[PDB]
mmCIF file of N, CA and C in Angstrom:
data_model
loop_
_atom_site.group_PDB
_atom_site.id
_atom_site.type_symbol
_atom_site.label_atom_id
_atom_site.label_comp_id
_atom_site.label_asym_id
_atom_site.label_seq_id
_atom_site.Cartn_x
_atom_site.Cartn_y
_atom_site.Cartn_z
ATOM 1 N N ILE Q 1 -30.030 1.691 4.630
ATOM 2 C CA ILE Q 1 -30.901 2.960 5.198
ATOM 3 C C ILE Q 1 -32.069 2.955 4.566
ATOM 4 N N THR Q 2 -32.865 2.823 3.969
ATOM 5 C CA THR Q 2 -34.031 3.126 3.119
ATOM 6 C C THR Q 2 -35.396 3.656 3.379
ATOM 7 N N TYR Q 3 -36.076 4.334 1.893
ATOM 8 C CA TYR Q 3 -37.478 4.995 2.969
ATOM 9 C C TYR Q 3 -38.059 4.414 1.883
ATOM 10 N N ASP Q 4 -39.547 3.830 1.838
ATOM 11 C CA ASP Q 4 -40.655 4.237 0.670
ATOM 12 C C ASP Q 4 -40.924 5.864 0.079
ATOM 13 N N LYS Q 5 -41.342 5.495 -1.046
ATOM 14 C CA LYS Q 5 -41.903 6.752 -1.613
ATOM 15 C C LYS Q 5 -42.792 6.489 -2.510
ATOM 16 N N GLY Q 6 -44.251 6.921 -2.940
ATOM 17 C CA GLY Q 6 -45.015 6.753 -3.802
ATOM 18 C C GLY Q 6 -44.907 8.521 -4.715
ATOM 19 N N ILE Q 7 -44.866 8.521 -6.793
ATOM 20 C CA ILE Q 7 -45.290 9.682 -6.636
ATOM 21 C C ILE Q 7 -46.649 9.760 -7.682
ATOM 22 N N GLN Q 8 -46.961 10.797 -8.127
ATOM 23 C CA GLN Q 8 -47.882 9.988 -9.446
ATOM 24 C C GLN Q 8 -47.685 11.870 -10.605
ATOM 25 N N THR Q 9 -47.297 11.236 -11.490
ATOM 26 C CA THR Q 9 -47.265 12.858 -12.791
ATOM 27 C C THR Q 9 -48.361 12.992 -12.592
ATOM 28 N N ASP Q 10 -48.738 14.849 -12.869
ATOM 29 C CA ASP Q 10 -50.123 15.325 -13.096
ATOM 30 C C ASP Q 10 -50.768 15.233 -13.727
ATOM 31 N N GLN Q 11 -50.301 14.570 -15.027
ATOM 32 C CA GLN Q 11 -51.103 14.944 -16.755
ATOM 33 C C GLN Q 11 -51.015 12.995 -16.944
ATOM 34 N N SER S 1 -35.318 24.802 -20.454
ATOM 35 C CA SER S 1 -35.721 24.083 -19.484
ATOM 36 C C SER S 1 -35.750 23.963 -18.190
ATOM 37 N N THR S 2 -35.210 24.900 -17.554
ATOM 38 C CA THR S 2 -35.567 24.719 -15.477
ATOM 39 C C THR S 2 -35.504 23.452 -14.752
ATOM 40 N N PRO S 3 -35.102 23.276 -14.446
ATOM 41 C CA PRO S 3 -36.237 21.895 -14.461
ATOM 42 C C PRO S 3 -37.211 22.597 -12.506
ATOM 43 N N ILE S 4 -38.244 21.139 -12.810
ATOM 44 C CA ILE S 4 -39.161 22.113 -11.395
ATOM 45 C C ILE S 4 -39.105 20.445 -10.554
ATOM 46 N N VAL S 5 -38.074 21.067 -9.075
ATOM 47 C CA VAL S 5 -38.066 19.367 -8.301
ATOM 48 C C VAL S 5 -39.604 18.878 -7.660
ATOM 49 N N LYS S 6 -39.970 18.358 -8.007
ATOM 50 C CA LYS S 6 -41.405 18.092 -6.989
ATOM 51 C C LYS S 6 -41.105 17.515 -5.575
ATOM 52 N N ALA S 7 -40.255 16.301 -5.153
ATOM 53 C CA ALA S 7 -39.790 16.209 -4.605
ATOM 54 C C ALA S 7 -38.521 15.389 -4.496
ATOM 55 N N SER S 8 -37.876 14.856 -3.366
ATOM 56 C CA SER S 8 -36.514 14.460 -3.073
ATOM 57 C C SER S 8 -35.874 14.214 -1.811
ATOM 58 N N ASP S 9 -34.575 13.350 -1.740
ATOM 59 C CA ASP S 9 -34.105 13.125 -0.622
ATOM 60 C C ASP S 9 -33.153 12.589 -1.127
ATOM 61 N N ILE S 10 -32.016 14.300 -1.374
ATOM 62 C CA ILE S 10 -30.595 14.104 -2.064
ATOM 63 C C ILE S 10 -30.090 14.858 -1.393
ATOM 64 N N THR S 11 -28.952 15.211 -2.154
ATOM 65 C CA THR S 11 -27.938 15.965 -1.328
ATOM 66 C C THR S 11 -27.810 16.780 -2.794
ATOM 67 N N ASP S 12 -26.647 18.123 -2.501
ATOM 68 C CA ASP S 12 -27.500 19.472 -3.446
ATOM 69 C C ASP S 12 -26.132 18.950 -4.217
ATOM 70 N N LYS S 13 -25.067 17.951 -4.119
ATOM 71 C CA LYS S 13 -24.037 17.968 -5.193
ATOM 72 C C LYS S 13 -24.012 16.977 -6.372
ATOM 73 N N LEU S 14 -24.898 15.344 -5.419
ATOM 74 C CA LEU S 14 -25.885 14.589 -5.732
ATOM 75 C C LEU S 14 -27.099 15.638 -6.737
ATOM 76 N N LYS S 15 -27.853 16.006 -6.847
ATOM 77 C CA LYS S 15 -29.206 16.414 -6.904
ATOM 78 C C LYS S 15 -28.835 17.389 -8.328
ATOM 79 N N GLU S 16 -27.550 18.438 -8.608
ATOM 80 C CA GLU S 16 -27.127 18.846 -9.819
ATOM 81 C C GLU S 16 -26.296 18.147 -10.913
ATOM 82 N N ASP S 17 -25.780 16.603 -9.931
ATOM 83 C CA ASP S 17 -25.877 16.714 -11.636
ATOM 84 C C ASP S 17 -26.862 15.115 -11.670
ATOM 85 N N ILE S 18 -27.410 14.614 -11.458
ATOM 86 C CA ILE S 18 -28.873 14.254 -11.648
ATOM 87 C C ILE S 18 -29.878 15.820 -12.912
ATOM 88 N N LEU S 19 -29.702 15.499 -12.417
ATOM 89 C CA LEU S 19 -30.498 17.023 -13.485
ATOM 90 C C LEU S 19 -30.076 17.474 -14.861
ATOM 91 N N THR S 20 -28.599 18.180 -14.471
ATOM 92 C CA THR S 20 -27.187 18.287 -15.510
ATOM 93 C C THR S 20 -27.288 16.731 -16.788
ATOM 94 N N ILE S 21 -27.102 15.852 -15.813
ATOM 95 C CA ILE S 21 -27.306 14.688 -16.892
ATOM 96 C C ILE S 21 -28.487 14.133 -17.757
ATOM 97 N N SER S 22 -28.930 14.879 -17.011
ATOM 98 C CA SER S 22 -30.892 14.705 -17.237
ATOM 99 C C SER S 22 -31.602 15.331 -18.684
ATOM 100 N N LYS S 23 -30.740 16.846 -18.614
ATOM 101 C CA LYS S 23 -30.993 17.809 -19.304
ATOM 102 C C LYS S 23 -30.335 16.974 -20.655
ATOM 103 N N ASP S 24 -29.157 16.738 -20.175
ATOM 104 C CA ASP S 24 -27.893 16.102 -21.594
ATOM 105 C C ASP S 24 -29.091 15.484 -22.580
ATOM 106 N N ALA S 25 -29.059 14.511 -20.969
ATOM 107 C CA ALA S 25 -29.694 13.010 -22.019
ATOM 108 C C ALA S 25 -31.318 13.247 -22.928
ATOM 109 N N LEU S 26 -32.104 14.163 -22.301
ATOM 110 C CA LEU S 26 -33.027 15.411 -23.192
ATOM 111 C C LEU S 26 -32.185 15.596 -25.215
ATOM 112 N N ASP S 27 -31.696 15.995 -24.482
ATOM 113 C CA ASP S 27 -30.701 16.437 -25.747
ATOM 114 C C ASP S 27 -30.055 15.257 -27.171
ATOM 115 N N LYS S 28 -30.371 14.567 -26.725
ATOM 116 C CA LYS S 28 -29.215 13.093 -27.599
ATOM 117 C C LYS S 28 -29.968 11.714 -28.241
ATOM 118 N N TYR S 29 -31.220 11.044 -27.001
ATOM 119 C CA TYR S 29 -32.815 10.949 -27.265
ATOM 120 C C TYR S 29 -33.266 11.680 -27.278
ATOM 121 N N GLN S 30 -34.522 10.863 -27.827
ATOM 122 C CA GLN S 30 -35.435 11.008 -27.832
ATOM 123 C C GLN S 30 -36.919 10.232 -27.777
ATOM 124 N N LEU S 31 -36.454 8.772 -27.086
ATOM 125 C CA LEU S 31 -37.235 7.791 -26.665
ATOM 126 C C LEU S 31 -37.194 7.555 -24.986
ATOM 127 N N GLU S 32 -38.131 7.858 -24.610
ATOM 128 C CA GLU S 32 -38.171 8.097 -23.116
ATOM 129 C C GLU S 32 -37.463 6.807 -23.060
ATOM 130 N N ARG S 33 -37.303 5.470 -22.797
ATOM 131 C CA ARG S 33 -36.597 4.783 -22.492
ATOM 132 C C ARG S 33 -34.961 4.666 -22.778
ATOM 133 N N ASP S 34 -34.924 5.110 -23.601
ATOM 134 C CA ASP S 34 -33.367 4.818 -24.285
ATOM 135 C C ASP S 34 -32.353 7.536 -22.896
ATOM 136 N N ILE S 35 -33.972 7.752 -23.371
ATOM 137 C CA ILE S 35 -33.581 9.257 -22.322
ATOM 138 C C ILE S 35 -33.320 8.464 -20.770
ATOM 139 N N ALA S 36 -34.706 7.550 -20.210
ATOM 140 C CA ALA S 36 -34.294 6.527 -18.852
ATOM 141 C C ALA S 36 -32.494 6.035 -18.837
ATOM 142 N N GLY S 37 -32.163 5.893 -19.767
ATOM 143 C CA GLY S 37 -31.044 4.300 -20.023
ATOM 144 C C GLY S 37 -29.728 5.310 -19.370
ATOM 145 N N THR S 38 -29.375 6.741 -20.161
ATOM 146 C CA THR S 38 -28.874 6.915 -20.136
ATOM 147 C C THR S 38 -28.104 7.293 -19.116
ATOM 148 N N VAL S 39 -28.914 8.253 -18.690
ATOM 149 C CA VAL S 39 -29.351 8.933 -16.670
ATOM 150 C C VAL S 39 -28.742 7.557 -16.442
ATOM 151 N N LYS S 40 -29.631 6.729 -15.993
ATOM 152 C CA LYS S 40 -29.228 5.905 -15.616
ATOM 153 C C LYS S 40 -27.713 4.759 -15.357
ATOM 154 N N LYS S 41 -27.310 4.630 -16.196
ATOM 155 C CA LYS S 41 -25.784 3.984 -16.769
ATOM 156 C C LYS S 41 -24.053 5.303 -16.317
ATOM 157 N N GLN S 42 -24.688 6.081 -16.184
ATOM 158 C CA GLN S 42 -24.092 7.594 -15.797
ATOM 159 C C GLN S 42 -24.324 7.587 -14.610
ATOM 160 N N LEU S 43 -25.131 7.204 -14.275
ATOM 161 C CA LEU S 43 -24.930 7.954 -12.117
ATOM 162 C C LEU S 43 -24.487 6.246 -11.909
ATOM 163 N N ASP S 44 -24.799 5.511 -12.394
ATOM 164 C CA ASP S 44 -24.062 3.962 -11.887
ATOM 165 C C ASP S 44 -22.935 4.249 -12.508
ATOM 166 N N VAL S 45 -22.421 4.694 -12.988
ATOM 167 C CA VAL S 45 -20.614 5.047 -12.786
ATOM 168 C C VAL S 45 -19.879 5.716 -12.239
ATOM 169 N N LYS S 46 -20.912 6.827 -12.218
ATOM 170 C CA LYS S 46 -20.347 8.282 -11.319
ATOM 171 C C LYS S 46 -20.720 7.901 -9.785
ATOM 172 N N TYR S 47 -21.688 6.968 -9.145
ATOM 173 C CA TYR S 47 -22.351 7.274 -8.170
ATOM 174 C C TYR S 47 -22.038 6.467 -7.478
ATOM 175 N N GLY S 48 -22.304 4.821 -8.401
ATOM 176 C CA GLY S 48 -22.228 3.239 -7.745
ATOM 177 C C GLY S 48 -23.767 3.300 -7.830
ATOM 178 N N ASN S 49 -23.735 1.479 -8.484
ATOM 179 C CA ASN S 49 -25.229 0.994 -8.154
ATOM 180 C C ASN S 49 -25.239 0.728 -7.405
ATOM 181 N N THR S 50 -26.720 0.730 -7.325
ATOM 182 C CA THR S 50 -27.440 0.833 -8.284
ATOM 183 C C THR S 50 -28.792 1.354 -8.660
ATOM 184 N N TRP S 51 -28.633 1.700 -10.003
ATOM 185 C CA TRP S 51 -29.536 3.412 -10.704
ATOM 186 C C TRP S 51 -30.834 2.562 -11.185
ATOM 187 N N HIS S 52 -31.852 3.346 -10.778
ATOM 188 C CA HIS S 52 -32.836 2.547 -11.495
ATOM 189 C C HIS S 52 -33.617 4.191 -12.034
ATOM 190 N N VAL S 53 -34.129 4.260 -13.327
ATOM 191 C CA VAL S 53 -34.888 5.879 -13.977
ATOM 192 C C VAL S 53 -35.971 5.654 -14.522
ATOM 193 N N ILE S 54 -36.827 6.334 -14.543
ATOM 194 C CA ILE S 54 -38.013 6.769 -14.824
ATOM 195 C C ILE S 54 -39.003 7.976 -15.759
ATOM 196 N N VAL S 55 -39.257 7.553 -17.135
ATOM 197 C CA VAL S 55 -39.067 8.659 -17.051
ATOM 198 C C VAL S 55 -40.561 9.135 -18.140
ATOM 199 N N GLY S 56 -41.403 9.820 -18.118
ATOM 200 C CA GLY S 56 -42.768 9.264 -18.725
ATOM 201 C C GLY S 56 -43.552 11.012 -17.838
ATOM 202 N N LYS S 57 -45.015 10.744 -19.056
ATOM 203 C CA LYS S 57 -46.052 12.317 -19.046
ATOM 204 C C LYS S 57 -46.662 12.228 -18.441
ATOM 205 N N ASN S 58 -47.117 9.897 -17.986
ATOM 206 C CA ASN S 58 -48.020 9.723 -17.429
ATOM 207 C C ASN S 58 -47.723 8.441 -16.593
ATOM 208 N N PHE S 59 -48.005 8.726 -15.095
ATOM 209 C CA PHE S 59 -47.760 7.510 -14.087
ATOM 210 C C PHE S 59 -47.393 7.861 -13.019
ATOM 211 N N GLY S 60 -48.103 6.935 -12.393
ATOM 212 C CA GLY S 60 -47.754 6.127 -10.693
ATOM 213 C C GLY S 60 -46.758 5.813 -10.235
ATOM 214 N N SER S 61 -46.293 5.676 -9.403
ATOM 215 C CA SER S 61 -44.987 4.767 -9.353
ATOM 216 C C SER S 61 -45.036 4.768 -7.207
ATOM 217 N N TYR S 62 -44.582 3.604 -7.010
ATOM 218 C CA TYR S 62 -44.246 3.248 -5.584
ATOM 219 C C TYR S 62 -43.257 2.950 -4.835
ATOM 220 N N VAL S 63 -41.531 2.679 -4.707
ATOM 221 C CA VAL S 63 -40.595 2.766 -4.267
ATOM 222 C C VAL S 63 -40.133 2.751 -3.052
ATOM 223 N N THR S 64 -38.766 1.768 -2.869
ATOM 224 C CA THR S 64 -38.032 1.951 -2.183
ATOM 225 C C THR S 64 -36.952 2.726 -2.451
ATOM 226 N N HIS S 65 -36.174 3.124 -1.509
ATOM 227 C CA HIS S 65 -34.655 3.337 -2.036
ATOM 228 C C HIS S 65 -33.854 4.098 -0.844
ATOM 229 N N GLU S 66 -32.191 4.161 -1.118
ATOM 230 C CA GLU S 66 -31.395 3.696 -0.395
ATOM 231 C C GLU S 66 -31.109 5.638 0.807
ATOM 232 N N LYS S 67 -31.534 6.134 0.834
ATOM 233 C CA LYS S 67 -31.598 7.605 1.940
ATOM 234 C C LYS S 67 -30.771 8.581 0.835
ATOM 235 N N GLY S 68 -31.053 9.399 1.284
ATOM 236 C CA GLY S 68 -30.721 10.592 0.217
ATOM 237 C C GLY S 68 -30.403 10.506 -0.973
ATOM 238 N N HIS S 69 -30.179 9.646 -2.130
ATOM 239 C CA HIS S 69 -31.070 9.174 -2.857
ATOM 240 C C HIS S 69 -31.726 8.530 -3.713
ATOM 241 N N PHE S 70 -32.618 10.262 -3.767
ATOM 242 C CA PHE S 70 -34.334 9.620 -4.370
ATOM 243 C C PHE S 70 -34.084 11.377 -4.682
ATOM 244 N N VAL S 71 -34.278 11.627 -6.782
ATOM 245 C CA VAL S 71 -35.691 13.160 -6.961
ATOM 246 C C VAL S 71 -36.044 12.436 -7.998
ATOM 247 N N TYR S 72 -37.543 13.115 -7.748
ATOM 248 C CA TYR S 72 -38.126 13.264 -8.603
ATOM 249 C C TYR S 72 -38.823 14.992 -9.235
ATOM 250 N N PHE S 73 -38.685 15.473 -10.704
ATOM 251 C CA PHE S 73 -38.351 16.359 -10.542
ATOM 252 C C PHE S 73 -39.648 16.361 -12.743
ATOM 253 N N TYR S 74 -39.738 17.943 -12.927
ATOM 254 C CA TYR S 74 -40.115 17.391 -14.546
ATOM 255 C C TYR S 74 -38.564 18.291 -15.307
ATOM 256 N N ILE S 75 -38.813 18.056 -16.484
ATOM 257 C CA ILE S 75 -38.099 19.017 -17.434
ATOM 258 C C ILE S 75 -39.664 19.336 -18.471
ATOM 259 N N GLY S 76 -39.907 20.666 -18.618
ATOM 260 C CA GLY S 76 -41.143 20.690 -19.276
ATOM 261 C C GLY S 76 -42.657 19.987 -19.190
ATOM 262 N N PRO S 77 -43.040 18.950 -19.795
ATOM 263 C CA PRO S 77 -43.916 18.095 -19.793
ATOM 264 C C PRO S 77 -43.401 16.515 -18.324
ATOM 265 N N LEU S 78 -42.043 16.123 -19.268
ATOM 266 C CA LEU S 78 -41.292 15.637 -19.072
ATOM 267 C C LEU S 78 -41.115 14.455 -17.902
ATOM 268 N N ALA S 79 -41.375 14.164 -16.387
ATOM 269 C CA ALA S 79 -41.205 13.662 -15.250
ATOM 270 C C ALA S 79 -40.047 12.156 -14.827
ATOM 271 N N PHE S 80 -39.456 13.062 -14.121
ATOM 272 C CA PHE S 80 -38.476 12.123 -14.035
ATOM 273 C C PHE S 80 -38.251 11.402 -12.176
ATOM 274 N N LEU S 81 -38.056 10.045 -12.806
ATOM 275 C CA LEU S 81 -37.991 9.108 -11.446
ATOM 276 C C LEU S 81 -36.644 8.603 -11.238
ATOM 277 N N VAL S 82 -35.879 9.052 -11.086
ATOM 278 C CA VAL S 82 -34.197 9.105 -10.378
ATOM 279 C C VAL S 82 -34.478 8.537 -9.044
ATOM 280 N N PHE S 83 -33.795 6.626 -8.600
ATOM 281 C CA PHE S 83 -33.519 6.581 -7.231
ATOM 282 C C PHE S 83 -32.182 5.398 -7.177
ATOM 283 N N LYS S 84 -31.840 5.705 -6.290
ATOM 284 C CA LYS S 84 -31.062 4.546 -5.797
ATOM 285 C C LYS S 84 -30.479 2.946 -4.757
ATOM 286 N N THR S 85 -30.578 1.885 -5.258
ATOM 287 C CA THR S 85 -30.957 1.006 -4.779
ATOM 288 C C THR S 85 -29.747 0.282 -3.810
ATOM 289 N N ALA S 86 -29.396 -0.334 -2.775
ATOM 290 C CA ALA S 86 -28.683 -0.607 -2.473
ATOM 291 C C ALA S 86 -27.552 -1.614 -3.727
#
């Protein structure tokens, strides 16, 4: 079972 | 420096292990690539394949991970993206 995830550094 | 967890889908034990392995990684290596590599390899051995690790100060990412195997956190200015696939 999977999920998708997007992340973004603050700098 | 105590890690700052920004996002996670993970159990407590696995999280503490990742954070511990990642702190030790920073003392061992200077290059982001090598830091990521030692985290990835240790997790593969302890928790099974297949782990992927990104370590850096500037990146955006979009990934697919196994349920309960995702954490994104900072240690100081350095961001860590750690996740497992099948």
